[PDB]
């Protein structure tokens, strides 16, 4: 009775896919990573008494010009989608992936959730939390900003990951 859940998390380089990641599994805020490189995480949760068994796929960077596959793995529940509101490439990006990603996927029944990073950042954001959260409503998706420097909003990314996957 102790659910398994797979989430991708998806991104442009540097946006924070590892910093939020690493953020909520291991309570510790980085500096710095291996960027180019697929890293997968577990973690335990219970979410309103459910344990969840977290696999948590860290992918490796990815901009206009990565491969996405035609077709979707069906042992993952789950696709966070991020971008910094610092980097407008970044925002950029997130749409591009999300299109392929619709490719990928198709009708299927997998949530994909947008999130915003670095809302610490105040005096560097180019991105309104307006543009990010009426983008995500455009797509019938789930929007958080986040701060990988604070662990409840990284918490917060992934448990409305798995509740959505859970609708
Ligand atoms: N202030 C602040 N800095 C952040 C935040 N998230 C990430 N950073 C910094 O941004 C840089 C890139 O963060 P990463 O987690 O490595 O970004 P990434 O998405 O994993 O990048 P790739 O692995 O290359 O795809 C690092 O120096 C982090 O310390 C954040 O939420 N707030
Ligand atoms: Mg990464």
């Known amino acids: ?4 859940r797979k989430i991708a998390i998806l991104g442009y380089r540097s946006v924070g896919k590892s910093s939020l990641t690493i953020q909520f599994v291991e309570g510790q805020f980085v500096d710095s990573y291996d ?5 997968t995480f577990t973690k335990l949760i219970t979410v309103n008494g459910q ?9 490796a960077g990815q901009d206009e ?3 996405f596959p035609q077709t979707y793995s069906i042992d993952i529940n789950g696709y966070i989608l991020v971008y910094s509101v610092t980097s407008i490439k ?9 299109g392929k990603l619709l ?3 198709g009708k299927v029944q997998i949530p994909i959730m947008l999130v915003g990073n670095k ?3 105040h005096m560097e954001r180019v991105i309104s939390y307006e543009e990010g959260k009426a983008l995500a409503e ?9 701060s990988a420097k604070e662990n409840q909003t990284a918490v917060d990314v992934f448990k409305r990951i798995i509740l959505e996957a859970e609708k």
Do not use: C, G, R
């Open 138 to 146: 455009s797509w019938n998706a789930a929007f958080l900003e986040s």
């Open 103 to 105: 490719d990928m996927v």
């Open 90 to 98: 970044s925002f950029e990006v997130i749409k591009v992936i999300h």
């Open 35 to 39: 960027p180019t490189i697929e890293n």
């Open 65 to 67: 010009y990565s491969i």
């Open 119 to 121: 809302k610490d950042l």
């Open 1 to 4: 009775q102790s659910k398994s």
């Open 51 to 59: 344990e969840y068994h977290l696999q948590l796929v860290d992918t």
